[PDB]
Enzyme design. Structure first.
Site, PDB file in Angstrom:
ATOM      1  N   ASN D 123       0.895  -1.293   0.003  1.00  0.00           N
ATOM      2  CA  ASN D 123      -0.057  -0.002   0.113  1.00  0.00           C
ATOM      3  C   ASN D 123       0.863   1.135   0.057  1.00  0.00           C
ATOM      4  O   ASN D 123       2.176   1.518   0.288  1.00  0.00           O
ATOM      5  CB  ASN D 123      -0.973   0.107   0.982  1.00  0.00           C
ATOM      6  CG  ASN D 123      -2.213  -1.100   1.228  1.00  0.00           C
ATOM      7  OD1 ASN D 123      -2.440  -1.830   1.926  1.00  0.00           O
ATOM      8  ND2 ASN D 123      -2.614  -1.121   0.110  1.00  0.00           N
ATOM      9  N   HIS D 178      -8.502   1.723  -2.912  1.00  0.00           N
ATOM     10  CA  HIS D 178      -8.698   0.659  -2.258  1.00  0.00           C
ATOM     11  C   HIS D 178      -8.540   1.428  -0.682  1.00  0.00           C
ATOM     12  O   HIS D 178      -7.680   1.537  -0.158  1.00  0.00           O
ATOM     13  CB  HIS D 178      -7.782  -0.291  -2.254  1.00  0.00           C
ATOM     14  CG  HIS D 178      -7.551  -1.109  -0.831  1.00  0.00           C
ATOM     15  ND1 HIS D 178      -8.397  -1.602  -0.332  1.00  0.00           N
ATOM     16  CD2 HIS D 178      -6.368  -1.819  -0.205  1.00  0.00           C
ATOM     17  CE1 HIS D 178      -8.073  -2.495   0.803  1.00  0.00           C
ATOM     18  NE2 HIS D 178      -6.654  -2.476   0.592  1.00  0.00           N
TER      19      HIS D 178
HETATM   20  N1  NAP Z   1      -6.018  -5.793   1.038  1.00  0.00           N
HETATM   21  C1  NAP Z   1      -5.827  -5.400   2.410  1.00  0.00           C
HETATM   22  O1  NAP Z   1      -7.017  -5.253   3.021  1.00  0.00           O
HETATM   23  C2  NAP Z   1      -4.652  -5.382   2.907  1.00  0.00           C
HETATM   24  C3  NAP Z   1      -4.751  -5.076   4.148  1.00  0.00           C
HETATM   25  C4  NAP Z   1      -3.406  -4.833   5.112  1.00  0.00           C
HETATM   26  C5  NAP Z   1      -2.006  -5.178   4.656  1.00  0.00           C
HETATM   27  N2  NAP Z   1      -2.116  -5.763   2.883  1.00  0.00           N
HETATM   28  C6  NAP Z   1      -1.033  -5.605   2.326  1.00  0.00           C
HETATM   29  O2  NAP Z   1      -0.337  -7.031   2.627  1.00  0.00           O
HETATM   30  C7  NAP Z   1       1.268  -6.730   3.059  1.00  0.00           C
HETATM   31  C8  NAP Z   1       1.415  -6.969   4.504  1.00  0.00           C
HETATM   32  O3  NAP Z   1       2.744  -6.921   5.079  1.00  0.00           O
HETATM   33  P1  NAP Z   1       3.788  -8.148   5.618  1.00  0.00           P
HETATM   34  O4  NAP Z   1       2.958  -8.988   6.544  1.00  0.00           O
HETATM   35  O5  NAP Z   1       3.886  -8.736   4.110  1.00  0.00           O
HETATM   36  O6  NAP Z   1       4.917  -7.543   6.375  1.00  0.00           O
HETATM   37  P2  NAP Z   1       5.695  -6.229   6.474  1.00  0.00           P
HETATM   38  O7  NAP Z   1       6.445  -5.955   7.762  1.00  0.00           O
HETATM   39  O8  NAP Z   1       4.486  -5.082   6.338  1.00  0.00           O
HETATM   40  O9  NAP Z   1       6.482  -6.126   5.291  1.00  0.00           O
HETATM   41  C9  NAP Z   1       7.625  -6.935   5.049  1.00  0.00           C
HETATM   42  C10 NAP Z   1       8.146  -6.767   3.606  1.00  0.00           C
HETATM   43  O10 NAP Z   1       8.544  -5.705   3.426  1.00  0.00           O
HETATM   44  C11 NAP Z   1      10.293  -5.507   3.242  1.00  0.00           C
HETATM   45  N3  NAP Z   1      10.693  -4.352   3.686  1.00  0.00           N
HETATM   46  C12 NAP Z   1      10.444  -3.586   4.842  1.00  0.00           C
HETATM   47  N4  NAP Z   1      11.273  -2.355   4.977  1.00  0.00           N
HETATM   48  C13 NAP Z   1      11.949  -2.427   3.664  1.00  0.00           C
HETATM   49  C14 NAP Z   1      12.877  -1.444   3.328  1.00  0.00           C
HETATM   50  N5  NAP Z   1      13.337  -0.430   3.768  1.00  0.00           N
HETATM   51  N6  NAP Z   1      13.325  -1.736   1.942  1.00  0.00           N
HETATM   52  C15 NAP Z   1      12.873  -2.832   0.925  1.00  0.00           C
HETATM   53  N7  NAP Z   1      12.128  -3.547   1.645  1.00  0.00           N
HETATM   54  C16 NAP Z   1      11.657  -3.245   2.841  1.00  0.00           C
HETATM   55  C17 NAP Z   1      10.719  -6.830   4.093  1.00  0.00           C
HETATM   56  O11 NAP Z   1      11.841  -7.079   3.329  1.00  0.00           O
HETATM   57  P3  NAP Z   1      13.202  -7.679   4.232  1.00  0.00           P
HETATM   58  O12 NAP Z   1      12.410  -8.778   5.241  1.00  0.00           O
HETATM   59  O13 NAP Z   1      13.910  -8.000   3.287  1.00  0.00           O
HETATM   60  O14 NAP Z   1      13.369  -6.411   5.107  1.00  0.00           O
HETATM   61  C18 NAP Z   1       9.569  -7.764   3.427  1.00  0.00           C
HETATM   62  O15 NAP Z   1       9.637  -8.080   1.999  1.00  0.00           O
HETATM   63  C19 NAP Z   1       1.394  -5.415   2.602  1.00  0.00           C
HETATM   64  O16 NAP Z   1       2.475  -5.096   1.546  1.00  0.00           O
HETATM   65  C20 NAP Z   1       0.190  -4.603   2.571  1.00  0.00           C
HETATM   66  O17 NAP Z   1       0.129  -3.668   1.591  1.00  0.00           O
HETATM   67  C21 NAP Z   1      -3.368  -5.771   2.399  1.00  0.00           C
END
Ligand code: NAP
Ligand code: NAP
Ligand code: NAP
Ligand code: NAP
Lengths: 313, 313, 313, 313
Positions: D123, D178
């Protein structure tokens, strides 16, 4: 069906509820946890519901604190994932003793409400299934644990892959402690029905290297992971499906044994059983080989030791 | 995938096309038949399409007479259900000889167009798989038949039911002729991985009464039915799924053996093989028991006899 | 669940029992037929069992003559495929009258034993569902027929194919007689939720050529086929699944209507209904378009005519 | 099929890889992450493998740091879950700008290796799908995001539940951001094919209370949860299945629009599209209602604003 998960907030607890909510047979899924982790469950309930969006499901999810398990009555089975995430200073005995009080706590609390199947996942799985049985005061057929079931599937894959045969053509298992002392039974291992021993390639099966990996898959923990997520949930779901559908499978779960295997008494350990709608409906007793039973003896010995230290906590 | 069915108008041919059209992997289903039964196929195509109404499917069904099998080229496998519905005056040798010309006819016609897998269903399945191989002039790995595969599943059910264990916990098989001389191998029969012999209840397994029924399931024919409908189709579909997906299962099909089992040469018979994307990728040779191999010897003898009478028709 | 099929020996009856035996919810499948076609059923039972060989199933199949339907009690639903295969000299009225006595016969015989859902497949489906209702003396919610359900799916495919969208993205239906007077409702037809009318390409939808084919799919009969095999069975299975699982789908079945659609009273006809565990739980009344209701009026008129000639046979 | 997930370590990334590894079509699953979270991935790979233990799967899982995406070449689609978990002090613009650099970073790095489909989950999904498109320099058909797809399913459930009809009988959708400005289209909402407006009960549909919950399901975050686990993964899997299988579904994803909807140009937003093997194969333009398009106008306006602030980061 009504399943209750105790510890639905943990990795496995979460993963497991997810899978269980998708099941056609799941009518009421009760997610139980301590007062402070109730928001994480309601947060889980909403999340699961999203994963179900679009597919048919009558899964009623409920959230409650572990104070009044009243709602958990009439559950076909109660899973227990609650437990301390181990710890550096923690020792095997130290770890055993701690979760013992946690599993026992719940065991007793559950027992008061009614008589249900207690599926113990938390470790030491054997020693904990033992404890839950002791504090639940249930029949040996109502309390069992994940034991060496996943280790068995893990052994099955390795083999099928070694022979280059469809996963389904193999059936093997590991009995004993879900730990270093686990015993693989190549005497009860068939490849397409044929005893593995009747194959030349068998002579080259890296049985030791293989068991090593299986045994030490506690590498999920060390390998930048909490300790396990889906691996377990996937297994659990299977075992639950086995119960609700009275499948009558010959799994290898941590169950209470008492003589079924000569030299093995008064201990919960990973042994072959017939699972159905009534839990551990039988502790299948088959003649092992000379060393399999010797090794199965030592494993139970180890486990029993801990069982004593825990029997009264 | 492109499968062609030769005899898509018969009971089994029809049932089989139905099941195959529902498969996600089925891209082009060719239904072939004689000039006079082309309306029955187009009638089948329309019918199948109705059964698919509402479900995703890219199954292109094609209908053609058995004159210009040009369209059957590039087929991953060609099934053959064509054959005379036996007859009162007809004798085993009489029946063998007749379908021989039918299967051989197609075998040769197919061979001209290309090199494909020929899955022979028509009886005598062994003697017919032999013939198709001889007239197709294909490699022993490209021609196989239903053989004792369904008899094996039939034996599996009976047993699992006798022990009261989940169908999946059993793996057994019948090798030899898909007829009176079929040989059941309890030496390659495991219950949950454990050799069936390691169970007390085994001693009470009505092995003779059981084999009798399996052996004589030609009662579909007599029991106010043409001879078989879904039973076979269900099996066939499985075997096809096994090929397209390179499953590598250890089935028991009618395949060409030559020494894999000492005393058994130059004959197509029901034997254990490893089926994959390349057909019969191996004729698994495991040591049988004293009488199993003696009985497996007599079976092949019987079959061979017919193979000679047919080799040049 | 306990389903009974009356006419399990016919093409559709057979195909349907096959599909129903594979269902996880099928506990007791009763195949009923006349005294002389009892061997064909037992022959069917054995055949189905073969198609199930290897897969889990607790489907108890039973065979009985249509003399003592005692065994059919407690059936969740009773399907009726019994009927005269039409005939050259036979006229619509001639055909209506004949099967009327057959369906009515069974309707009454069934009614005596208990109160169950009667799913009428035999033609004229509308006129026959009407008859079964009259002779069964059941509640309008317990008697329904295949009606225009398959014609609806048939229309759905054609459209989805015309627009090049996933089969699931379309929902349309044909109300009225399951015959020449069937009425397609493009006013209740959405493409991905969007009224089909909101698409330019719609203006080019060969609605007339399309309905023609749907309407005349009685070409299975003429096209070297008995009349229908799997097409129907596939539909039936769906509708049964809908009942046992209380799906609450808005299907288009032949049900008893009485004013739900202004100008349509005292007639069983293809109309939209909400199917659940209690049969036709509602005859959804939505405003049609000027001509849809005019055409739906004429259809019911036609059907009613036959209903009179049959009401007392 | 070869899918790559960028951020396979996060909740959604993990859940998604799990589901994708179980798919029959998944041949090579590439889990990519930063150098320091490589152990968490290998830890994930081992975990997933456990959940697959016993089921057929040829899923090759690979782990790599986000330095040499060389291995990600030939991927059918690359999912991006990478992103900052928002934060207290963080503002919408603050959050937009930050993940922008992260998604853009990967977008560009990916683009260098090859031309693939970029499925943006992070997002603000719209603003991020926009960015990925801009920095990837790909064709508008190769870059899309989760957008309002899950919000649409969420709206679908609510409705189907309000009318008491099977989940499948409803098809509705939410177009636009969204976020708070999302627009529900009741003009493209059918109940069993029938425009929802043709039902009396509709007049009582709590459309405002309902949208409120959908809109604010960012309560997974606040409700003692990281932010989302399975909800998304489940959706993602569906959308991927849609691509690999060229389903041709009319989903509502965040895609690049340019005039398809009058008054909406140069912006990635939640709009109806036809997804197939080639990504966003069409941005379906249907006439909305007076206010739906007015509201859809304001939504795009909001989103565009952010797109500018991000276009060059
Ligand atoms: N449709 C919906 O209703 C809804 C609701 C909530 C969330 N979501 C989506 O689903 C996902 C949820 O997040 P999540 O559980 O995957 O964990 P998170 O902690 O939000 O994201 C982890 C990811 O981000 C990377 N990252 C963090 N800081 C970074 C930086 N400075 N540079 C590059 N990469 C970085 C991490 O890489 P490393 O591990 O390599 O650091 C890992 O790949 C989100 O992308 C969000 O948009 C959708
Ligand atoms: N069989 C295997 O292969 C395998 C592998 C790894 C781990 N495990 C076992 O399975 C479980 C997995 O843990 P996880 O990933 O779900 O997450 P976790 O953080 O290790 O455990 C979370 C669970 O522990 C409970 N808990 C924590 N402290 C507690 C206390 N003092 N009293 C009572 N309950 C307490 C939590 O309940 P609240 O939210 O109520 O605090 C929650 O249910 C563990 O017991 C572990 O030993 C098995
Ligand atoms: N493995 C088992 O358990 C089992 C059980 C029962 C039967 N079977 C075998 O499987 C087949 C089943 O038969 P069915 O029920 O499908 O129906 P059927 O009426 O016995 O056979 C119909 C098929 O035979 C073909 N046929 C008939 N006369 C022919 C001729 N003179 N030349 C070439 N083809 C001819 C038909 O082709 P046209 O329409 O082109 O004439 C059609 O393909 C038989 O070959 C039978 O021996 C196997
Ligand atoms: N929706 C569609 O588009 C569509 C199209 C075509 C057909 N269909 C339907 O599907 C079915 C197809 O028929 P089918 O393949 O099942 O075989 P069939 O030969 O049409 O009917 C056989 C059944 O009718 C019974 N029967 C025949 N004469 C009888 C009599 N005088 N008294 C009592 N019962 C009698 C038979 O009983 P015994 O064996 O005991 O004699 C058997 O149960 C029909 O009911 C038809 O309405 C639907």
């Amino acid at each position: 069906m009504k399943v209750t998960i105790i510890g639905a907030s943990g990795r496995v607890g979460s993963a497991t509820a997810l899978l269980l909510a998708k099941e056609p047979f799941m009518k009421d899924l009760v997610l139980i946890g301590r007062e402070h982790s109730i928001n994480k469950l309601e947060g889980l309930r909403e999340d699961i519901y999203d994963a179900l969006a679009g597919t048919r499901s009558d899964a009623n999810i409920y959230v409650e604190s572990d104070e009044n398990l009243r709602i958990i009555d009439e559950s076909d089975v109660v899973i227990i994932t609650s437990g301390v995430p181990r710890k550096e200073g923690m020792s095997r005995m130290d770890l055993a003793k701690t979760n013992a009080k946690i599993v026992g706590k719940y065991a007793k609390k559950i027992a008061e409400i009614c008589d249900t199947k207690i599926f113990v996942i938390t470790n030491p799985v054997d020693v904990m299934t033992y404890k839950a049985l002791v504090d639940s005061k249930f029949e040996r057929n109502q309390v069992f644990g994940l034991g060496t079931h996943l280790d068995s599937l893990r052994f099955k894959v390795a083999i099928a892959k070694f022979f280059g045969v469809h996963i389904d053509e193999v059936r093997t298992r590991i009995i004993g402690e879900h730990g270093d002392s686990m015993v693989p039974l190549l005497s009860a291992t068939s490849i397409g029905g044929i005893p593995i021993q009747k194959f030349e390639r068998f002579k080259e099966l890296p049985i030791d290297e293989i068991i090593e990996d299986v045994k030490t898959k506690g590498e999920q923990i060390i390998r930048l992971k909490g300790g396990s997520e889906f691996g377990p949930a996937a297994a659990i779901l299977n075992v639950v499906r086995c119960i609700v559908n009275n499948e009558k499978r010959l799994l290898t779960l941590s169950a209470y044994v008492d003589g079924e295997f000569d030299g093995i008494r008064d201990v919960c350990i990973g042994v072959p059983v017939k699972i159905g709608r009534d839990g551990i409906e039988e502790v299948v007793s088959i003649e092992l080989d000379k060393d399999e039973i010797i090794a199965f003896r030592k494993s139970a010995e180890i486990i029993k030791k801990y069982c004593e230290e825990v029997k009264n906590l």
